[PDB]
Amino acid sequence: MRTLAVETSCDETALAIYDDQKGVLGNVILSQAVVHSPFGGVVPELSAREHTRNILPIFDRLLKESRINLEEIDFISFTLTPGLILSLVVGVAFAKALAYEYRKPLVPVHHLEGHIYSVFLEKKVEYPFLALIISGGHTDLYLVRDFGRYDFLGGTLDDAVGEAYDKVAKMLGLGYPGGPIIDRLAKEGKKLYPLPKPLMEEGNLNFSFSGLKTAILNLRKEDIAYSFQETVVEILLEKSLWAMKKTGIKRLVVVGGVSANSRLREVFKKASQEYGFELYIPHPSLSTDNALMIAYAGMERFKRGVVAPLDVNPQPNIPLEEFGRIWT
Amino acid sequence: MRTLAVETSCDETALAIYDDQKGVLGNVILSQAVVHSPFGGVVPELSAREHTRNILPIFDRLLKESRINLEEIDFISFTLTPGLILSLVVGVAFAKALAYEYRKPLVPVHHLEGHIYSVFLEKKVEYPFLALIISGGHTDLYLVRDFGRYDFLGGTLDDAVGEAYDKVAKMLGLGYPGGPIIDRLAKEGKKLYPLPKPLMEEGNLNFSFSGLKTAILNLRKEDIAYSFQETVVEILLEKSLWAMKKTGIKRLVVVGGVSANSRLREVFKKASQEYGFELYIPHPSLSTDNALMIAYAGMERFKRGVVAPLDVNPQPNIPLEEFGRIWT
Amino acid sequence: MKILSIDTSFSFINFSVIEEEKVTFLHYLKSNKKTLELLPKIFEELCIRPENFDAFAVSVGVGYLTSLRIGVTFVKTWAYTLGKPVVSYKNLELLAKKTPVPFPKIPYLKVGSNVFYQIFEESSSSEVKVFKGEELRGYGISLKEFEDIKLGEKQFFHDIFPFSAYGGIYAYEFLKENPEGENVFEIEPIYVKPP
Amino acid sequence: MKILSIDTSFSFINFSVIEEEKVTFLHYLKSNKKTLELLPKIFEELCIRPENFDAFAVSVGVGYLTSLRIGVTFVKTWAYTLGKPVVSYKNLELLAKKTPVPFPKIPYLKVGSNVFYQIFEESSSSEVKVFKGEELRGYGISLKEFEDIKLGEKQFFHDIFPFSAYGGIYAYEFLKENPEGENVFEIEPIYVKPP
Ligand SMILES: Nc1ncnc2c1ncn2[C@@H]1O[C@H](COP(=O)(O)OP(=O)(O)O)[C@@H](O)[C@H]1O
Ligand SMILES: Nc1ncnc2c1ncn2[C@@H]1O[C@H](COP(=O)(O)OP(=O)(O)O)[C@@H](O)[C@H]1O
Numbered sequence A, B: 001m002r003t004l005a006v007e008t009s010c011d012e013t014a015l016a017i018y019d020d021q022k023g024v025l026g027n028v029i030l031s032q033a034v035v036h037s038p039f040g041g042v043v044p045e046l047s048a049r050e051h052t053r054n055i056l057p058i059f060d061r062l063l064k065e066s067r068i069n070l071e072e073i074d075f076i077s078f079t080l081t082p083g084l085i086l087s088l089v090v091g092v093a094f095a096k097a098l099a100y101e102y103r104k105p106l107v108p109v110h111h112l113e114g115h116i117y118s119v120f121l122e123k124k125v126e127y128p129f130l131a132l133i134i135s136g137g138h139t140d141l142y143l144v145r146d147f148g149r150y151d152f153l154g155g156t157l158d159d160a161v162g163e164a165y166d167k168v169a170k171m172l173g174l175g176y177p178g179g180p181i182i183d184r185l186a187k188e189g190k191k192l193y194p195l196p197k198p199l200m201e202e203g204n205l206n207f208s209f210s211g212l213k214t215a216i217l218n219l220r221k222e223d224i225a226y227s228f229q230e231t232v233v234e235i236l237l238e239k240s241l242w243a244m245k246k247t248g249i250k251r252l253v254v255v256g257g258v259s260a261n262s263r264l265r266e267v268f269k270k271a272s273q274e275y276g277f278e279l280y281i282p283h284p285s286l287s288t289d290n291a292l293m294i295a296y297a298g299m300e301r302f303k304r305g306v307v308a309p310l311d312v313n314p315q316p317n318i319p320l321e322e323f324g325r326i327w328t
Numbered sequence C, D: 001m002k003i004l005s006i007d008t009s010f011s012f013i014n015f016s017v018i019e020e021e022k023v024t025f026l027h028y029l030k031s032n033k034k035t036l037e038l039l040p041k042i043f044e045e046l047c048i049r050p051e052n053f054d055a056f057a058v059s060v061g062v063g064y065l066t067s068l069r070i071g072v073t074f075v076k077t078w079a080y081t082l083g084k085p086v087v088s089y090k091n092l093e094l095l096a097k098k099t100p101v102p103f104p105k106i107p108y109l110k111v112g113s114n115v116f117y118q119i120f121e122e123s124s125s126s127e128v129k130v131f132k133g134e135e136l137r138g139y140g141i142s143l144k145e146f147e148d149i150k151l152g153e154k155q156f157f158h159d160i161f162p163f164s165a166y167g168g169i170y171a172y173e174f175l176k177e178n179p180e181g182e183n184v185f186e187i188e189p190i191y192v193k194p195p
C-alpha cells in the first residue's frame, strides 16, 4: 500500500511518499523560517504565498528523487486541521487536484494525530498509551486507546512550551526559532538559578509556562537558558509521571518539535530507565513537522475504510478528540 | 390509468386525456385546413408556426373542459414519427416540457400505430388481424400479430388514396381537402364511366392510383367523382380480400382519414356481410387525426413497461414495422 | 425574485438564473446535438426545476426558428401551468443596447444563409433587414462566431454574449414596472421572412 | 486545440472550454460556498476531466487572494503533471481591452474593502492602484455587482463578464505565437499589497 502525503498546516511545505511494505519512498520539505524571521513570528498571509510558490517545485523534486508514478499511489493523505487556514487550503487544493486527476481516494489527517504516529514509523506502540504532544502551539497530554480514539487529559493554560522558548529567546535577544537556540546555549550554563512553579495544585494534568517570563525579567545568559530549560523539562516530566500514575499506563509517546530538544530527551530517557516505563521518542527529523507522519496516520485511517468526499473542507481548529470520532 | 396524449405530426394540433377505466376525459383539436387551403397543400414551415401558436390555447381549453389536474396523469403519450419534422418537434417539446415539470414518464407512439388502435376505443380486436391504413399519404396493408408487431404486406407504388382524391378534386377545380368534396359530390353521379386498372398482376398486395388522373383528363362532373370513387373503393376492397385469402385472417381493421368516406364504408360493410369476415371501422371522428388514438396506443406500450428517455428525438419517417420492434 | 432565462437561438444554447437583479447562474454549451436531444435532459443534469422559479424569460430571436419554437414552447408551458410571469426578449436589441459604441449601431447575426441586421439610433430603430452586400453607415456589432462578416464602417465582435444572461437581467427590470409580464399565449419567435 | 480556462477571482466562480478559437462551454455560478467546497466537486458533476485538454488558462486576478491561490494551484498541478501548456491572464486588462469606450479606460473591481483600479491608454497603462475617492479622468469600467461604485467621468457596467471565457480566448491567441505557454512554476496571483 502506498500514499502521497501533503502537509501545509503552518510554516513548512512537506510532501512524502510512504509504502507500508517498502517504507519511505520520498520525503521533501521546505521550511519558511528564513522568511518569517524578520517578524519574530509566522505571518499568515505571507505563509500562504510561500506555500503556493514552493509546493510545485517541491513536488518536482519529490518526483525526481522518488522515481514513483502517481498512477501507482493508492490514496492521497493530507492535513485537514488544525493550522493556519490560509496555508491549509494550499495543501488541500494540491491534494484534491491530484486526487481528482488520478482518481485516487482522499484521506484526511489531524496534524496532532500525525505527531502521535510519527514514532510508529520506527516502532509500533501497543494500545493504550499516553501521548505528550509538545509543539509551537500545543502542550497536551492525551490517552490514546486506539487509532481515532484520543482522550484529552490536559493542556496549556497559557503558553505552549514552544512559545515559551520563543519568548525567552527574544527576551534574551537571540533569534526566532527560540527552541534550538536555547537548547544549544543551555549546554554552557552549569549554575541553575531556581524559578517559581505555577499556582495550580499537584496532580493537575494541565500546564502553565508564561509566568517564567515574569521571573526571568526579575532576574549569566547561558545560566538563564540552562535554568529555564531545566525548569520546563522538569515540569513536562512531572506531569507525565502524574498521568501514568493516574491512568495506570506505562507507555509514553513524546512527540512534536520540542521533542527534538536534546535535554528533554536526556531527562525522559533517564526517567524511563529509573521508573521502568516504555518511552518512544522519534528521530529528531520526525519530531518537527513532516509529511511522513501524515502518511502513516493516513494509512491507518484508509485501512479502516474511511475516505473523504471530494468537497471536504479544511478548518482552523477541530479538537483532536472530536476529529477522531468524526473521521474513524 | 390515465394519459395526456399529444399529436402534431401533420396539420392538426390534437390533445386528449384518456382513462382506461373512465374512457375519454378530454379531447380538443384544431385543424389547419383554413390556413393551408390557399396553397393546395400543407406548407411545412407554416404548419410549424400554427402548432406553436395554437398548442397553448388548445391546452387551456382541454384543462377547463376536462377539469383534470396534470398531477393526476400517469404518463404522457405522444406521436414521435412519422410526419413533418418541424411540426413534430412542437408537440414533442410540449410533451417533454410537461413530463419533466410533473415528473411523468414519456411514451412514444407511431402515428400509423395510432390509426390502428383508433378502433380499439370502441371495441378490442383479437389478434392477429389485418389493418388497411388509408390516409393522405399512406395506403398500406399490415398484418398485426400483437401490439408492437406489424408485418408490412403492401403499400402504394405512387399516390396514396388521400392524395388521389386531392388531385382529382383540384383537377375538377373544387377545393383542397379533396376527399370530403368528392364523397359528397359522388352521391349525384349515377352513371359510372369505366376506368383502367393498374399494370401489376392480380394477387399483388401493393396499390397504384396515379394513372387514373391520366384517364380522367382523357375523359358530367358528378359522374366523374362517382366513377373515380367507385374505382378507388373497389381497388381497396379487392386488395383487402386478396390479403385475407393470402393470410387466412378474417378480421379487417380499416382506419385513417379516408376510412371516413361514406361509400367506402358501404362497400366494406357490404363485403363483410356477404363474405362473413369481421370488420372494424371507427366512428368518423376517430378516422381522421386525433390524440385519442395516440392515447390508446400509449396505454398499450406503457402497460408493457416501455418508456422513453428524456432526450428522445422525433424523426420524419421510421417505418411502422421497425418502430414496433424498437419500442416494444 | 428568481428568474429562469433561456436562449435557444443558436447552437450555443444557454440558460441563466437571475436573482437580486444579477446573474447567479449561467450554463452555455455549443453543441451539434439536436435541440430536443439537449432539452430537457440538460436541465435534469443541472438540477434546474421549473417550479423553483418566480418568473421566466425566453429569447424570441432572431435565431434558428425550429430551436426557437422548441425553447419558447418549453417556457410557455411552464409559465402557463405554474401561473408565473414570462418575459420575451430580442437578441439584436440587446446587442445594440449593451454595446457602448457610437450611434448608429448595426447589430447583426447569421441564421443559415441570411445575415439579419437592424439599425439603431438613439431614439429609434429600423426593422430587421436581410443583408445583401450594401455599404452601411455606422458601427456593426456581432459575435466572434461571425467575425468573417463585416457590416458597417467599423465592427465590434463580442468574444461571448450569452443572450439568456442579458435577457434575464432585462426581464428582471421589466417585471419591476410590469409584474404581470407579457401575455404567455402571444409569445412567439420573430419571423423576418414568410413561409 | 482544446483549452480548459478557470476563474476563481470572485464568488461568481466560472470556467470555460475553448476550441476552434471560440467558447464552446461556460459554467458560471455565484455561490456562498467555500472555494474548496466547490472545487473539484463541481468538475466531477460537469464531467470536466483535466486529461481531456491540450492546455489550461487561469486568472491571476485581481480577486480574492485565497480563492485565486486555490484555483491557481489546481491548474498548475494539472498542467505540470500532464505536461501541458498553461497561460495566465489578468482581469483588469481584459475589462479594458474588451470594452470599446474611449481612452483613458479605468477598469476597476472591489475585493473586500479595496477598490482596485488600473488606468489604460492606447499604448500604456498604470499599475494597479487602490481607490481613495479621487476624481479621475476617463471612462470607468466594471461589473453590475459593483454598480454602486463610480470611478472616472462616466461609467460602463457589464451585466456579466465571465473572466474565464475572455481569458481562455486570450490564451488560445497567446499559444499560437508562444505554444510553450508560460512557466508553470512562476504562475501566481497578482499581489497589490504586501503581507
Ligand atoms: N532543539 C529544540 N529544542 C527545543 N525546542 C525545539 C527544538 N527544535 C524545535 N523546537 C521547537 O519545536 C517547535 C516546532 O515544532 P513543530 O511540531 O514542527 O511545530 P508546529 O507543529 O507547532 O508548527 C518550535 O517552537 C521550536 O522552537
Ligand atoms: N369523407 C371523406 N372521403 C374521402 N376521403 C376523406 C374523407 N374525409 C377525410 N378524407 C381524407 O383523409 C385524409 C386525412 O386523413 P388523416 O389520417 O387525418 O391524414 P394524415 O394522417 O395523412 O394527416 C385527407 O386526405 C382526406 O382527403
Ligand SMILES: [Fe+3]
Residues within 6 Å of the ligand: A111, A115, A135, A256, A257, A288, A289
Ligand atoms: Fe507540528
Ligand SMILES: [Fe+3]
Residues within 6 Å of the ligand: B111, B115, B135, B256, B257, B288, B289
Ligand atoms: Fe393520420
